[PDB]
Amino acid sequence: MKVRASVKKRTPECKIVRRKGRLYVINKKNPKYKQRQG
Amino acid sequence: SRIGKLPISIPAGVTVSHKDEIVTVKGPKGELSQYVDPRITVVIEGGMIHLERKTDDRIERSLHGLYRSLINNMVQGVSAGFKRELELVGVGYRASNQGQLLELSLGFTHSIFMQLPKEVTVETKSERNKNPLIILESADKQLLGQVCMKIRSFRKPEPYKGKGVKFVGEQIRRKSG
Amino acid sequence: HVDCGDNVIVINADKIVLSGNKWDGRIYLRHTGYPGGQRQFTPRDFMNKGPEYLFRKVVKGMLPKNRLGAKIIGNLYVYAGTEHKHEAQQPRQLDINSL
Amino acid sequence: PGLLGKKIGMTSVFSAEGKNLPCTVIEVGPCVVTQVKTLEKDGYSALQLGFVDAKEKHTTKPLAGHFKKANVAPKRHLAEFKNFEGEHKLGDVLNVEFFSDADFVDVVGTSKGKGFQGVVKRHGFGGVGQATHGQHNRLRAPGAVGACSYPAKVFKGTRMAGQMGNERVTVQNLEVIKVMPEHNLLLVKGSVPGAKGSILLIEK
Amino acid sequence: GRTYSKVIKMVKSPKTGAYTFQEEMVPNEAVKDFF
Amino acid sequence: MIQQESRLVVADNSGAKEALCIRVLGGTRRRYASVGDIIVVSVKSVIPSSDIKKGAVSKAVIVRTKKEVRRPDGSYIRFDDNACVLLNAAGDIRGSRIFGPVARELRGTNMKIVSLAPEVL
RNA sequence: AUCCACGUCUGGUGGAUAAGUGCUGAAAGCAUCUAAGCACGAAGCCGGCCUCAAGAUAAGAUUUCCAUAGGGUG
RNA sequence: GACGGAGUGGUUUGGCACCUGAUGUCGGCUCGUCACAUCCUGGGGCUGGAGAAGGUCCCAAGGGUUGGGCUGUUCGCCCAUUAAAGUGGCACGCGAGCUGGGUUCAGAACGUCGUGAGACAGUUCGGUCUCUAUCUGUUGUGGGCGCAGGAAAUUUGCG
RNA sequence: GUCUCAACCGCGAUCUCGGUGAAAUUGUAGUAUCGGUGAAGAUGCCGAUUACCCGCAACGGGACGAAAAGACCCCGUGAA
RNA sequence: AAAUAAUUGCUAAGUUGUAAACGAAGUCAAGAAG
Ligand SMILES: C=C[C@]1(C)C[C@@H](OC(=O)CS[C@@H]2CC[C@@H](N)C[C@H]2O)[C@]2(C)[C@H](C)CC[C@]3(CCC(=O)[C@H]32)[C@@H](C)[C@@H]1O
Ligand SMILES: [K+]
Ligand SMILES: [K+]
Ligand SMILES: [Mg+2]
Ligand SMILES: [Mg+2]
Ligand SMILES: [Mg+2]
Ligand SMILES: [Mg+2]
Ligand SMILES: [Mg+2]
Ligand SMILES: [Mg+2]
Ligand SMILES: [Mg+2]
Ligand SMILES: [Mg+2]
Ligand SMILES: [Mg+2]
Ligand SMILES: [Mg+2]
Ligand SMILES: [Mg+2]
Ligand SMILES: [Mg+2]
Ligand SMILES: [Mg+2]
Ligand SMILES: [Mg+2]
Ligand SMILES: [Mg+2]
Ligand SMILES: [Mg+2]
Ligand SMILES: [Mg+2]
Ligand SMILES: [Mg+2]
Ligand SMILES: [Mg+2]
Ligand SMILES: [Mg+2]
Ligand SMILES: [Mg+2]
Ligand code: NA
């Protein structure tokens, strides 16, 4: 997981979800693209 | 919703009711009760379950599909059931149940003993030269999913070899060393 | 400058309603007087002690901050259930919605 | 649960394994139940015990009516213990055999009184400077008591000189060496607070 | 080794109603007591 | 009761004669070292034509102390001096003979000292 | 004897959570730990341990005595 | 992570000159208290993570966080340890609490500048640290009255 | 015993009682805390918070505490 | 001190009642291409 002020997809299989007021980028196939704080 | 505007064809030999905001499905595998929110209404007609909502607001658009699926999961739960197969991978890993007691040797120093509720029956077909297989059945998707991931949590599969507790034929993240 | 109000009895106070995310979202702050002595608590923390500990704190702060206000807060009696013992005083009934 | 005792003194004994052990001798004398406290009347359940025989000349009339009700000989010391098992009633008698099944005990006492003491002995302060090297008169001084204009005050809880000792102290998990029912004697390993002849509470 | 073993059973909870998870580590010759 | 800057007799035939304690091992503010403890020393003096040199840094183990040592059976032992024995990097001793008595505490630490000492306690 | 350490003995003991992990699951036919619900999850928070503590002027409770009870001075 | 860009803070060096018939100054000692931008210990995500050992980021301030040689030193270098030898604020915390080695009085000397009296991006030896605590603050310990008659004990625990 | 790292002992001072009895200082005071505000670092302003009335011992954070019309610095068509 | 006044919408953040480059677009109104 990395924390950025601007989170993007960066990969075609990434999806942006909101979990308790915060944005996350999730990717089960390749977890190295996980992000937080959209 | 597209999902929540779908009838559920009530199968043979199961009875459905509605009393005090609670929807209750009874069948061969047991009975399941699910509270339904007063702003999403259901009526049992012709042996079919129809849902409808008054206002098109997002607080009901989310609830409409949600309550169609919770009932649709209950009806198939009390008629057929639900299947999950766990396959222990890695030498020295054995599974064997006596009654409802489950015994697991997953590589630690200690052993693991788990008692399941009567909702989740347990069976274990473990052949020689072949990996042990854990089979769980129930009528509740949510609870059987709760038990299945607790067993897998004891030993999650690793990438370097396929070793660990996996769902049967599950796609596994692999990574050479 | 005189105590001219009415003695008030509140009943069914355990069914008071707070809106929003206020029960465990409204932070109170107080200090013990020792260094590093600030503490937090919520309206639900008061409710555990009892209705008379939330109502007294809320009604205080809407009263004058003087000696007279300290006296008149003692003219308030708050009860959880519907049962009290003041039948010797002959309490009158008032619809608070009429105020 | 527990009983009242009197501190006698210390000695050292050899065990069967062949170890030298410091032991404290306590007279856990007979205690009578002087009052039973219950939920429905008092708000909690406990037992009040009385330990040392008292002359009538030393017992006030309010306390005389207290023991006469319980129908026991008046006592000098009174204490409460909770969480018993056996439902003793008024006027029952308890003794050292209560601890005959006890492996460890807690002892509550009052420490020896040191009077008014300085920061060096009360709190272990280091002292200011050396004994030489320009020292004038702050050998046993506390040093600074705070910061400058911000704060601009001494904080609560600052460690200073004052009264030391003569206070309730608890020592936990004392190993029981032997129980002597003949003399109402109990033997424990280690030391307990207080001077000889002081009154102790021993918790099972 | 062979000085303890892990035991789990699930009990319904009054606060919610769904099953919780009870866990300990008891010596190998004590699980029959627990279950 | 040995601490930093203490001087000990060297009680083996390692060549060294007097040693100065630099550190008591095994803890942030460990103040004192007793019999059977490990310390770090500097060699202060040597016999002419010896193996180790004056000013070398070495590990050592204490075998005698002037401060009395307590035993669980109620007995005590003290000696006329403080003495140690130099050890090598692999934990063994650098000499052949031990001169003088050694304490019984080393029966639980180093059997090499006890086997080749004139007397134990 | 007392006072001491360099001595001796003793001590540092369920709930709700953070970052995270999930189950079921729509809005949005799929996906999704969340939107309705639910199971976890830190030496941290609250309890649990020790001491003080009803001037807690909201001044609490119990047992008994007096209306010779009980005290002060010595 | 180059070329570039947007902010936050006010612990550095500055800019301004707004408070001051006197607002004691470096370093150390003593005594602390607070923050978290975490050194150790606790919990996690990712890894170019086989294991072991790491790297990086996230949550976390409960406790802990060494002794020496040199130097007035802060800071640094070195020696030996430790789980670790954190970073800062509080008048660069703290001199009506200590010291007085340094800086910054009057003596003297060197280099250097000046015709000289003298002077210093310098250096060197020496050179008085005052006050009986009123208010508040803090640590202990009492007297009076109250607590809806007066007393002797035992107590619950708001905190 | 300079220190690790302090411990104990004796007299004088100290504390209590009897006798005698000053001084520095002092606009008036029933003189609490926190943050804010402000001639820009608040006992005294604002909003909250805490606090029954009156002493004694002990320590020095604040009252930009006291003492001295700053010696530094600049200024005076000052002085030596 | 004086309206728990009347009517119509927006906000779910206690935002409010007294900061930016850059993200995601949470939601409401009016359009454009297709
Ligand atoms: C005399 C004034 C002092 C004691 C000290 C003063 O130091 C100086 O004057 C350094 S110059 C020095 C003076 C003596 C001369 N003979 C030689 C010359 O070298 C200092 C540090 C400040 C720079 C000014 C303000 C101050 C209060 C706060 C403070 O820290 C003080 C004043 C008001 C203070 O009363
Ligand atoms: K202040
Ligand atoms: K304003
Ligand atoms: Mg005494
Ligand atoms: Mg000292
Ligand atoms: Mg001096
Ligand atoms: Mg002196
Ligand atoms: Mg779905
Ligand atoms: Mg500043
Ligand atoms: Mg002035
Ligand atoms: Mg942090
Ligand atoms: Mg300073
Ligand atoms: Mg001074
Ligand atoms: Mg000062
Ligand atoms: Mg000169
Ligand atoms: Mg001289
Ligand atoms: Mg002085
Ligand atoms: Mg004397
Ligand atoms: Mg006198
Ligand atoms: Mg201010
Ligand atoms: Mg202020
Ligand atoms: Mg002054
Ligand atoms: Mg002037
Ligand atoms: Mg009004
Ligand atoms: Na010249």
DSSP string of D128-178, one letter each residue: SS-SSSS--S-TT-------STTT-SPPTT----EEEE-SEEEEEEEEEEE
State phi, psi for B60 to the nearest 5 degrees. -95, -30
Tokens of D111: 């420490």
Tokens of C10: 């509140």
d(CA B170, CA D44): 60
Residues near F27 by Cβ (< 8 Å), separated by ≥ 6? none
Q: Which chain E residues are closer than 8 Å to B113 by Cβ? A: 5-8, 31, 35
CA of C41: nearest nucleotide by C1' is: G46
Q: Which chain D residues are closer than 8 Å to C38 by Cβ? A: none
State phi, psi for D161 to the nearest 5 degrees. -75, 155
Task: Classify strands D2-14 and D168-180 as parallel, antiparallel or unpaired.
Answer: unpaired
Tokens of C31: 């200090």
> What angle is formed at CA F48 by the lines to CA F47 and CA F52, rounded to 5 degrees?
65
Half-sphere exposure for F111 (CA within 13 Å, toward CB):
0
Q: Which chain D residues are closer than 8 Å to C34 by Cβ? A: 155-157
Which nucleotides on chain H have any atom < 7 A from a protein Cβ?
A: 28-35, 44-50, 57-58, 62, 65-67, 79-85, 90-95, 97-100, 137-141, 151-156, 158-159
Half-sphere exposure for B167 (CA within 13 Å, toward CB):
10
d(CA B153, CA A5): 33
D155 touches chain C (CB under 8 A): yes
Q: How many Cβ atoms from other residues are within 10 Å of residue C90's Cβ?
A: 6
User: What was the resolution (in A) of this experimentally determined structure?
Assistant: 2.6
CA of D138: nearest nucleotide by C1' is: H98
Half-sphere exposure for C59 (CA within 13 Å, toward CB):
17
Q: Which of B34, B18, B43 is nearest to B77 (CA)?
A: B34
Residues lining strand J at under 7 Å (Cβ) are: A 5-8, 16, 18, 21, 23, 38; B 58; C 19-22, 25
Q: How many angstroms is it from A28 CA to the middle of ligand 4?
A: 73
Residues near A11 by Cβ (< 8 Å), separated by ≥ 6? A27, A30, A33
One-letter identity of residue C98: S
Q: Evaluate the CA torsion angle D65, D66, D71, D72 in order and state its sign.
A: negative
d(CA B155, CA B112): 11
CA of A32: nearest nucleotide by C1' is: H46
Q: What is the 3-state secondary structure (H, E, C) of F44-101?
A: EEECCCCCCCCCCEEEEEEEECCCCEECCCCCEECCCCCEEEEECCCCCECCCCECCC
Chain B nearest-CA residue for E1: B109
From the CA of C23, how many Å to the C1' of G45?
A: 18
d(CA D183, CA F3): 49
Residues in chain D: 204
Residue C96, SS3 per DSSP: helix
Tokens of B25: 């499905």
C36 touches chain D (CB under 8 A): no
From the CA of D152, how many Å to the C1' of H93?
A: 11
The ligand whose atoms approach the alpha carbon of D133 most closely is 6
Query: Tokens 């070793």 appear where?
Result: B163
Q: Which of C60, C88, C84 is nearest to C72 (CA)?
A: C60
d(CA C90, CA A25): 66
> In C, residues 48-87, which contact D (CB 8 Å cutoff)?
none
Residues near B33 by Cβ (< 8 Å), separated by ≥ 6? B22, B23, B24
Half-sphere exposure for D190 (CA within 13 Å, toward CB):
12
d(CA B64, CA D77): 74
One-letter identity of residue C47: M
d(CA C76, CA C96): 15
CA distances from D145 to B94, C89, D22, D124, D141 (A): 68, 58, 42, 16, 11
Q: In this complex, do E6 and B113 lie within 8 Å of one another by their Cβ atoms?
A: yes
d(CA F25, CA F72): 24
Is the CB of residue C6 less than 8 Å from the CB of residue C99?
A: no
* Burial (CB count <10 Å: 0-12, 13-18, 19+), residue B68: buried
Q: How many Cβ atoms from other residues are within 10 Å of residue F4's Cβ?
A: 13
D 126-145: CB within 7 Å of strand I = 126-127, 130-133, 138, 141-142, 144-145
For residue C36, give how far its alpha carbon lies from the nearest alpha carbon of chain D (Å): 10
Q: Evaluate the CA torsion angle D50, D52, D53, D55 in order and state its sign.
A: negative
Query: Tokens 């008891």 appear where?
Result: E26
Is the C-beta atom of D146 closer than 7 angstroms to strand I? yes
The ligand whose atoms approach the alpha carbon of D147 most closely is 14
Of B110, B112, B117, the CB nearest to E19: B117
Is the CB of residue F10 less than 8 Å from the CB of residue F51?
A: no
d(CA F74, CA F92): 32
> What angle is formed at CA C83 by the lines to CA C77 and CA C88, rounded to 5 degrees?
70
Task: Classify strands B22-26 and B15-19 as parallel, antiparallel or unpaired.
Answer: antiparallel
Residue B175, SS3 per DSSP: coil
Half-sphere exposure for D137 (CA within 13 Å, toward CB):
0
* Burial (CB count <10 Å: 0-12, 13-18, 19+), residue C31: exposed
Interface residues of D toward F, Cβ cutoff 8 Å, are: 12, 14, 18-20
D17-39 in b/e burial notation, b at 16+ Cβ within 10 A? Answer: eeeebebbbbbbbbbbbbbbeee
Task: Classify strands F83-87 and F7-10 as parallel, antiparallel or unpaired.
Answer: parallel
Q: Which residues surround ligand 4, an ion (CB under 5 A)?
A: D 113
d(CA D33, CA D91): 5
Distance from chain centroid for Cα F28? 21
d(CA B121, CA B139): 10
Is the CB of residue F65 less than 8 Å from the CB of residue F2?
A: yes
For residue E31, give how far its alpha carbon lies from the nearest alpha carbon of chain B (Å): 8
DSSP designation for B163: -
State phi, psi for D128 to the nearest 5 degrees. -100, 125
For residue B108, give how far its alpha carbon lies from the nearest alpha carbon of chain E (Å): 9
Q: What is the 3-state secondary structure (H, E, C) of B52-76?
A: ECCCCCHHHHHHHHHHHHHHHHHHH
CA of C25: nearest nucleotide by C1' is: J14
CA Rg value for chain D: 23
The answer to whether E and B touch (≥3 CB pairs < 8 Å) is yes
The ligand whose atoms approach the alpha carbon of D125 most closely is 5
Query: Tokens 């396959």 appear where?
Result: B87
Tokens of D91: 């006027």
Is the CB of residue A37 less than 8 Å from the CB of residue A21?
A: no
Method used to determine the 3D structure: cryo-EM
d(CA B169, CA D147): 69
From the CA of B131, how many Å to the C1' of G32?
A: 33
d(CA C70, CA B149): 60
Which own/partner contact pairs does B151-158 have at CB distance under 8 Å and 24+ positions apart?
B151/B86, B151/B102, B151/B104, B151/B114, B152/B86, B154/B104, B154/B106, B154/B112, B155/B106, B155/B107, B157/B89
Query: Tokens 């007591």 appear where?
Result: E33
Tokens of D103: 């492996």
Interface residues of F toward D, Cβ cutoff 8 Å, are: 72-74
Q: In this complex, do C33 and D155 lie within 8 Å of one another by their Cβ atoms?
A: no
Is the CB of residue D49 less than 8 Å from the CB of residue D78?
A: yes
Residues near B53 by Cβ (< 8 Å), separated by ≥ 6? B4, B39, B40, B41, B60, B61, B63, B64
d(CA D173, CA C17): 51
Q: Which of B68, B103, B70, B110 is nearest to B88 (CA)?
A: B103
Q: Which of B82, B47, B53, B83 is nearest to B66 (CA)?
A: B53
Q: In this complex, do E4 and B117 lie within 8 Å of one another by their Cβ atoms?
A: no
Tokens of D98: 């209560």
Residues near A2 by Cβ (< 8 Å), separated by ≥ 6? A34, A35, A36
d(CA B125, CA F66): 73
Which nucleotides on chain I have any atom < 7 A from a protein Cβ?
A: 1-8, 33-34, 41, 43, 48-50, 57-63
For residue B97, give how far its alpha carbon lies from the nearest alpha carbon of chain E (Å): 14
Residues near E29 by Cβ (< 8 Å), separated by ≥ 6? none
Q: Extract the runs of DSSP E, i.e. beta strands, from chain A.
A: 2-3, 15-18, 23-26, 35-36
Q: In this complex, do E19 and B146 lie within 8 Å of one another by their Cβ atoms?
A: yes
